[PDB]
Design a binder for this molecule. Structure first.
Ligand SMILES: N=C(N)N1CCC[C@H](C[C@@H](C=O)NC(=O)CN2CCC[C@H](NS(=O)(=O)Cc3ccccc3)C2=O)C1
Ligand code: NA
Ligand code: NA
Lengths: 249, 8, 26
């Protein structure tokens, strides 16, 4: 995260760390039930970079605060049972449908530091996914286009689709939204390397619940003027999400 | 990274 | 069910230090 600040203890209890058993931080992820994690497909599979992670290559770490300490009595580390990538994920061109589900080997237990985020309903999505409304991104990724000691947080405004489109050469899909301040705004912030797969969440003003609207997906550099971070559009892919849990867990 | 339990 | 209600904030009626910035934008 660039230009963010340290998270408060238990501020983002659905925040998950995708950890490679070299033992390294792959990406964030989010807890949506006691057995299901949501992340970016590219965190697992990106053939251009020769990245194709399997169930047995990874570990999921939940309830974490610190990036590197093993937080004895606080975090829980699970083994994956199965990985599901969106059948139409487009890794060949624009990371369209950049989403995967990981089903844990065993249901995790909730605690002050571990709690699932909600998935939006069409109507939550309809009223919140508006240009200028702010969401929150979290992660342990780079601080600069080094690495934080604790979880970072940044609040960012959703930007109008045209503005998104006109900032890049990549073709933008209905499955993506972009967020960030405009050069004029004199407020910065962005996700950065290592933040991928983390949650873009918003707090509903109707029921005071936190909803995960986006997934950290792609961008070009970190916190560049006139550029914006791009996120997977969770609601547009919710059908696929339900389909898998239902058809399998 | 501080090492993690081996049981994991 | 209990999704998105944080044990240390919502469940205790405490606010995190920047959540008003979100609500204020809506
Ligand atoms: N939010 C911003 N600004 N981003 C920039 C800082 C990396 C951040 C996430 C990061 C992983 O942790 N995601 C990526 O690496 C996804 N990805 C994979 C390949 C390279 C690509 N970036 S790019 O090459 O500049 C432009 C591009 C985007 C999509 C597909 C191919 C090209 C990219 O963004 C995303
Ligand atoms: Na363009
Ligand atoms: Na920018």
């Amino acid at each position: 995260i660039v230009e963010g600040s340290d998270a408060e203890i238990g501020m983002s209890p659905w925040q998950v760390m995708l950890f490679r058993k070299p033992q390294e931080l792959l990406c964030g992820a989010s807890l949506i039930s006691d057995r299901w994690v949501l992340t970016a497909a590219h965190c697992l599979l990106y053939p251009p970079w020769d990245k194709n992670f399997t169930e047995n290559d990874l570990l999921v770490r939940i309830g974490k605060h610190s990036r590197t300490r093993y937080e004895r009595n606080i975090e829980k580390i699970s083994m994956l049972e199965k990985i599901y990538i969106h059948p139409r994920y487009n890794w060949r061109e624009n990371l369209d449908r950049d989403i995967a589900l990981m089903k844990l080997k065993k249901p995790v237990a909730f605690s002050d530091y571990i709690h699932p985020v909600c998935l939006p309903d069409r109507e939550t999505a309809a009223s919140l996914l508006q240009a200028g409304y702010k969401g929150r991104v979290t992660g342990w990724g780079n601080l600069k286009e080094g690495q934080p000691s604790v979880l970072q947080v940044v609040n960012l405004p959703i930007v109008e689709r045209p503005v998104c489109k006109d900032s890049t050469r990549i073709r933008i899909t209905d499955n993506m939204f972009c967020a960030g301040y405009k050069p004029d705004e004199g407020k910065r912030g962005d996700a950065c390397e290592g933040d991928s797969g983390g949650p873009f969440v918003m707090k509903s003003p109707f029921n005071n619940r936190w909803y995960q609207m986006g997934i950290v997906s792609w961008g070009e550099g970190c916190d560049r003027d006139g550029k914006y971070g791009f996120y997977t559009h969770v609601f547009r892919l919710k059908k696929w999400i339900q389909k898998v849990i239902d058809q399998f867990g | 990274f501080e090492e993690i339990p081996e049981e994991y | 069910a209990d999704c998105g209600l944080r044990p240390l904030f919502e469940k205790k009626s405490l606010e995190d230090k920047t959540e008003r910035e979100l609500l204020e934008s809506y």
